[PDB]
Amino acid sequence: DPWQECMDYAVTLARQAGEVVCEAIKNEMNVMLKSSPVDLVTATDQKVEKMLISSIKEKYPSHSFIGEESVAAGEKSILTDNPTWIIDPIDGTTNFVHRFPFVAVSIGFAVNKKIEFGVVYSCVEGKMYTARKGKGAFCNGQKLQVSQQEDITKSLLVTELGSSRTPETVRMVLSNMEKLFCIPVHGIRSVGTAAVNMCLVATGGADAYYEMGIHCWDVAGAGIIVTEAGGVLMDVTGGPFDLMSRRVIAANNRILAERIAKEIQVIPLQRDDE
Protein backbone atom coordinates (compact mmCIF):
# COMPACT_ATOMS: atom_id res chain seq x y z
CA ASP A 1 0.00 0.00 0.00
CA PRO A 2 1.19 3.74 -0.13
CA TRP A 3 1.65 3.54 3.67
CA GLN A 4 3.86 0.41 3.21
CA GLU A 5 6.39 2.55 1.21
CA CYS A 6 6.21 5.15 4.08
CA MET A 7 6.73 2.35 6.63
CA ASP A 8 9.68 0.83 4.67
CA TYR A 9 11.30 4.30 4.56
CA ALA A 10 10.61 4.80 8.32
CA VAL A 11 12.54 1.52 9.08
CA THR A 12 15.50 2.76 6.93
CA LEU A 13 15.46 6.15 8.80
CA ALA A 14 15.13 4.49 12.25
CA ARG A 15 18.22 2.33 11.43
CA GLN A 16 20.26 5.38 10.19
CA ALA A 17 19.21 7.31 13.36
CA GLY A 18 20.15 4.26 15.53
CA GLU A 19 23.64 4.11 13.95
CA VAL A 20 24.15 7.82 14.80
CA VAL A 21 22.92 7.19 18.39
CA CYS A 22 25.16 4.04 18.72
CA GLU A 23 28.19 5.97 17.50
CA ALA A 24 27.47 8.96 19.86
CA ILE A 25 26.85 6.75 22.99
CA LYS A 26 30.56 5.69 22.98
CA ASN A 27 31.88 9.30 23.06
CA GLU A 28 31.95 12.16 25.59
CA MET A 29 28.79 14.28 25.64
CA ASN A 30 27.73 17.79 26.55
CA VAL A 31 24.59 17.13 28.61
CA MET A 32 22.13 20.04 28.38
CA LEU A 33 19.04 20.77 30.54
CA LYS A 34 15.42 21.29 29.39
CA SER A 35 12.67 21.80 32.09
CA SER A 36 14.80 20.79 35.16
CA PRO A 37 18.27 19.32 36.18
CA VAL A 38 16.69 15.84 35.46
CA ASP A 39 15.07 16.59 32.08
CA LEU A 40 18.02 16.02 29.70
CA VAL A 41 18.92 16.80 26.11
CA THR A 42 22.04 16.33 24.00
CA ALA A 43 23.13 17.63 20.57
CA THR A 44 22.42 13.99 19.43
CA ASP A 45 18.65 14.16 20.25
CA GLN A 46 18.42 17.45 18.29
CA LYS A 47 20.60 16.34 15.31
CA VAL A 48 18.67 13.02 14.98
CA GLU A 49 15.31 14.81 15.06
CA LYS A 50 16.44 17.39 12.39
CA MET A 51 17.73 14.57 10.12
CA LEU A 52 14.44 12.56 10.49
CA ILE A 53 12.10 15.53 9.87
CA SER A 54 14.20 16.97 6.98
CA SER A 55 14.43 13.42 5.43
CA ILE A 56 10.66 12.72 5.61
CA LYS A 57 9.74 16.37 4.62
CA GLU A 58 11.88 16.08 1.45
CA LYS A 59 10.15 12.80 0.42
CA TYR A 60 6.60 13.70 1.64
CA PRO A 61 6.28 17.53 1.78
CA SER A 62 2.48 17.46 2.41
CA HIS A 63 2.91 15.30 5.59
CA SER A 64 2.76 16.79 9.13
CA PHE A 65 5.17 16.31 12.09
CA ILE A 66 5.14 16.16 15.89
CA GLY A 67 8.66 15.81 17.32
CA GLU A 68 9.81 16.06 20.96
CA GLU A 69 12.73 18.46 20.30
CA SER A 70 10.75 20.49 17.74
CA VAL A 71 8.01 20.94 20.42
CA ALA A 72 10.79 22.02 22.92
CA ALA A 73 11.95 24.54 20.21
CA GLY A 74 8.43 26.09 20.06
CA GLU A 75 6.49 23.87 17.59
CA LYS A 76 2.83 22.93 18.24
CA SER A 77 2.02 19.33 19.23
CA ILE A 78 -1.45 19.34 17.59
CA LEU A 79 -2.80 16.19 15.84
CA THR A 80 -4.88 16.70 12.64
CA ASP A 81 -6.29 14.14 10.13
CA ASN A 82 -3.33 14.78 7.74
CA PRO A 83 -0.61 11.99 7.58
CA THR A 84 1.53 12.80 10.67
CA TRP A 85 4.98 11.53 11.73
CA ILE A 86 5.21 11.42 15.55
CA ILE A 87 8.89 11.23 16.49
CA ASP A 88 10.92 10.63 19.66
CA PRO A 89 14.49 10.89 18.23
CA ILE A 90 15.95 9.31 21.40
CA ASP A 91 13.45 7.83 23.84
CA GLY A 92 15.57 7.23 26.92
CA THR A 93 17.89 10.29 26.85
CA THR A 94 18.85 9.68 30.50
CA ASN A 95 19.79 6.06 29.56
CA PHE A 96 21.74 7.43 26.56
CA VAL A 97 23.79 9.88 28.69
CA HIS A 98 24.60 7.01 31.10
CA ARG A 99 25.20 4.27 28.45
CA PHE A 100 22.32 2.30 30.14
CA PRO A 101 21.64 -0.23 27.32
CA PHE A 102 18.01 0.65 26.40
CA VAL A 103 17.89 3.61 23.97
CA ALA A 104 15.16 3.80 21.32
CA VAL A 105 14.37 5.76 18.16
CA SER A 106 10.53 5.87 17.92
CA ILE A 107 8.42 6.72 14.85
CA GLY A 108 4.62 6.59 14.89
CA PHE A 109 2.60 7.39 11.75
CA ALA A 110 -0.99 8.70 12.05
CA VAL A 111 -3.73 9.05 9.37
CA ASN A 112 -7.11 10.53 10.52
CA LYS A 113 -5.63 10.73 14.11
CA LYS A 114 -5.25 6.86 14.11
CA ILE A 115 -1.85 5.07 14.09
CA GLU A 116 -1.26 3.15 10.81
CA PHE A 117 2.26 1.97 11.67
CA GLY A 118 4.97 2.12 14.29
CA VAL A 119 8.74 1.61 14.32
CA VAL A 120 10.78 1.38 17.57
CA TYR A 121 14.49 0.71 17.10
CA SER A 122 16.28 -0.34 20.34
CA CYS A 123 19.72 0.49 18.81
CA VAL A 124 22.06 -0.84 21.59
CA GLU A 125 20.26 -4.23 21.37
CA GLY A 126 19.98 -4.09 17.59
CA LYS A 127 16.25 -4.81 17.93
CA MET A 128 13.97 -3.37 15.24
CA TYR A 129 10.33 -3.56 16.49
CA THR A 130 7.72 -2.84 13.80
CA ALA A 131 3.95 -3.13 13.27
CA ARG A 132 1.42 -2.16 10.59
CA LYS A 133 -2.36 -2.07 11.30
CA GLY A 134 -3.80 -5.54 10.55
CA LYS A 135 -0.34 -6.98 9.59
CA GLY A 136 1.01 -8.08 13.00
CA ALA A 137 3.98 -7.02 15.16
CA PHE A 138 7.61 -8.11 14.70
CA CYS A 139 11.04 -7.86 16.28
CA ASN A 140 13.75 -8.51 13.63
CA GLY A 141 11.30 -10.62 11.61
CA GLN A 142 10.10 -12.62 14.66
CA LYS A 143 6.30 -12.39 15.08
CA LEU A 144 5.32 -11.02 18.52
CA GLN A 145 2.53 -12.22 20.84
CA VAL A 146 1.45 -10.74 24.22
CA SER A 147 1.28 -13.09 27.25
CA GLN A 148 -1.96 -14.95 28.18
CA GLN A 149 -1.85 -13.91 31.91
CA GLU A 150 -5.32 -13.00 33.22
CA ASP A 151 -4.47 -13.27 36.96
CA ILE A 152 -3.19 -9.91 38.31
CA THR A 153 -1.50 -11.72 41.27
CA LYS A 154 0.75 -13.61 38.79
CA SER A 155 1.55 -10.52 36.60
CA LEU A 156 4.74 -8.58 35.93
CA LEU A 157 4.39 -4.79 35.36
CA VAL A 158 6.66 -2.17 33.76
CA THR A 159 6.58 1.54 34.59
CA GLU A 160 8.81 4.63 34.93
CA LEU A 161 9.09 7.12 37.84
CA GLY A 162 8.81 10.16 35.54
CA SER A 163 10.62 13.45 34.94
CA SER A 164 8.93 15.32 37.83
CA ARG A 165 10.67 15.81 41.18
CA THR A 166 7.74 17.83 42.71
CA PRO A 167 7.25 16.20 46.18
CA GLU A 168 3.44 16.00 45.67
CA THR A 169 3.75 14.38 42.18
CA VAL A 170 6.46 11.92 43.41
CA ARG A 171 4.20 10.83 46.36
CA MET A 172 1.27 10.10 43.93
CA VAL A 173 3.60 8.07 41.56
CA LEU A 174 4.97 5.98 44.48
CA SER A 175 1.51 5.58 46.12
CA ASN A 176 0.16 4.19 42.79
CA MET A 177 3.21 1.86 42.68
CA GLU A 178 2.58 0.69 46.30
CA LYS A 179 -1.12 -0.16 45.56
CA LEU A 180 -0.30 -2.29 42.49
CA PHE A 181 2.75 -3.81 44.24
CA CYS A 182 0.57 -4.90 47.24
CA ILE A 183 -2.36 -6.45 45.24
CA PRO A 184 0.18 -8.27 45.02
CA VAL A 185 1.68 -8.39 41.54
CA HIS A 186 4.81 -10.53 40.89
CA GLY A 187 6.89 -7.38 40.41
CA ILE A 188 7.59 -4.05 38.75
CA ARG A 189 10.42 -3.41 36.28
CA SER A 190 11.84 -0.21 34.75
CA VAL A 191 14.30 -0.21 31.80
CA GLY A 192 14.13 3.57 31.36
CA THR A 193 12.14 4.12 28.16
CA ALA A 194 8.34 4.02 27.61
CA ALA A 195 8.75 2.78 24.01
CA VAL A 196 11.00 -0.18 25.05
CA ASN A 197 8.79 -0.92 28.09
CA MET A 198 5.78 -1.19 25.73
CA CYS A 199 7.73 -3.37 23.24
CA LEU A 200 8.51 -5.69 26.19
CA VAL A 201 4.75 -6.02 26.78
CA ALA A 202 4.30 -6.77 23.00
CA THR A 203 6.90 -9.63 23.31
CA GLY A 204 5.06 -11.17 26.31
CA GLY A 205 8.13 -10.66 28.56
CA ALA A 206 6.03 -8.32 30.76
CA ASP A 207 2.23 -8.42 31.15
CA ALA A 208 1.41 -4.68 31.25
CA TYR A 209 2.86 -1.15 31.20
CA TYR A 210 1.35 1.99 32.72
CA GLU A 211 2.50 5.59 33.03
CA MET A 212 1.32 9.19 33.48
CA GLY A 213 3.41 12.10 32.21
CA ILE A 214 4.44 10.54 28.90
CA HIS A 215 3.78 12.36 25.62
CA CYS A 216 2.32 11.31 22.22
CA TRP A 217 5.88 10.78 20.83
CA ASP A 218 6.79 8.26 23.62
CA VAL A 219 3.82 5.97 22.79
CA ALA A 220 2.92 6.58 19.10
CA GLY A 221 5.40 4.02 17.76
CA ALA A 222 4.99 1.32 20.43
CA GLY A 223 1.19 1.49 20.87
CA ILE A 224 0.46 -0.26 17.55
CA ILE A 225 3.28 -2.79 18.26
CA VAL A 226 1.37 -3.78 21.48
CA THR A 227 -2.07 -3.99 19.75
CA GLU A 228 -0.70 -5.86 16.68
CA ALA A 229 0.86 -8.36 19.18
CA GLY A 230 -2.71 -8.96 20.53
CA GLY A 231 -2.61 -6.41 23.36
CA VAL A 232 -4.79 -3.42 24.37
CA LEU A 233 -4.35 0.36 25.03
CA MET A 234 -6.53 2.17 27.60
CA ASP A 235 -6.48 5.45 29.53
CA VAL A 236 -5.47 5.09 33.25
CA THR A 237 -9.14 6.07 34.04
CA GLY A 238 -10.30 2.92 32.18
CA GLY A 239 -11.61 5.03 29.30
CA PRO A 240 -10.50 4.95 25.63
CA PHE A 241 -6.78 5.44 24.93
CA ASP A 242 -6.00 9.03 23.94
CA LEU A 243 -2.63 9.72 22.31
CA MET A 244 -2.59 13.41 23.50
CA SER A 245 -3.78 12.68 27.13
CA ARG A 246 -0.29 12.11 28.79
CA ARG A 247 -1.69 8.79 30.19
CA VAL A 248 -1.46 5.14 29.10
CA ILE A 249 -2.04 1.51 30.11
CA ALA A 250 -0.61 -0.86 27.45
CA ALA A 251 -1.46 -4.44 28.49
CA ASN A 252 -1.72 -8.02 27.17
CA ASN A 253 -5.54 -7.89 27.79
CA ARG A 254 -8.55 -5.89 29.09
CA ILE A 255 -8.68 -7.89 32.39
CA LEU A 256 -5.22 -6.73 33.54
CA ALA A 257 -5.64 -3.21 32.03
CA GLU A 258 -8.96 -2.59 33.87
CA ARG A 259 -7.57 -4.01 37.18
CA ILE A 260 -4.54 -1.62 36.96
CA ALA A 261 -6.85 1.40 36.15
CA LYS A 262 -8.84 0.71 39.41
CA GLU A 263 -5.66 1.25 41.55
CA ILE A 264 -4.30 4.34 39.81
CA GLN A 265 -5.05 7.85 41.09
CA VAL A 266 -4.73 10.38 38.21
CA ILE A 267 -1.90 13.03 38.31
CA PRO A 268 -3.04 16.46 36.85
CA LEU A 269 -1.14 17.01 33.58
CA GLN A 270 -1.12 19.52 30.70
CA ARG A 271 -2.41 17.65 27.60
CA ASP A 272 -0.28 17.63 24.41
CA ASP A 273 -3.17 19.31 22.52
CA GLU A 274 -3.52 22.29 24.98
Binding residues for Mg(2+) are 68, 88, 90-91, 218
Q: Which of 155, 148, 160, 133 has its CA nearest to residue 224? A: 133
Binding map of Mg ion across residues 207-236, x = CB under 5 A, - = no contact: -----------x------------------
By CB under 8 A, residue 147 contacts a second copy? yes
Q: Which of 242, 246, 233, 176 has its CA nearest to residue 202? A: 233
* Pairwise CA distance, residues 121 & 125, whole Å: 9
- Residue 68 partner contact from Mg ion, a second copy, none using kind-dependent CB cut-offs of 5 to 8 Å: Mg ion
36: phi then psi, degrees, rounded to nearest 5: -160, 170
- Please name the amino acid found at residue 44: T
Per-residue H/E/C for 47-88: HHHHHHHHHHHHHCCCCEEEEHHHHHCCCCCCCCCCCEEEEE
- Please name the amino acid found at residue 191: V
Distance of CA 105 to CAs 15, 20, 252, Å?
8, 11, 23
By CB under 5 A, residue 88 contacts Mg ion? yes
Q: Which is nearer to Mg ion, 44 or 93 (CB)?
A: 93
Binding map of a second copy across residues 96-125, x = CB under 8 A, - = no contact: -xxxxx------------------------
The one among 49, 68, 211, 272 contacting Mg ion by CB under 5 A: 68
Active site residues per annotation: 68, 88, 90-91, 93, 218
Task: Enumerate binding residues for a second copy (CB under 8 A).
Answer: 31, 37-38, 40, 94-95, 97-101, 147, 153-154, 156, 161, 165, 167, 170-171, 174, 177-178, 181-182, 184-192, 200, 203-207
